[PDB]
Amino acid sequence: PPKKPKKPGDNATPEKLAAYEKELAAYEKELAAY
Numbered sequence: 234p235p236k237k238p239k240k241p242g243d244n245a246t247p248e249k250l251a252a253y254e255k256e257l258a259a260y261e262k263e264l265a266a267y
Contacts, residue, residue, distance in 0.1 A: 235260055235263035235264055236260070237260050238260060239253070241253055
């Protein structure tokens with residue numbers, strides 16, 4: 234089971250969302266393999 238990164242809400246900077254989107258891209262990759 235691949236771990237979904239924690240999604241930063243509105244109380245976070247876009248730069249932190251960028252990090253999330255990058256981890257999300259990794260997660261979605263592993264998810265596709267799942």
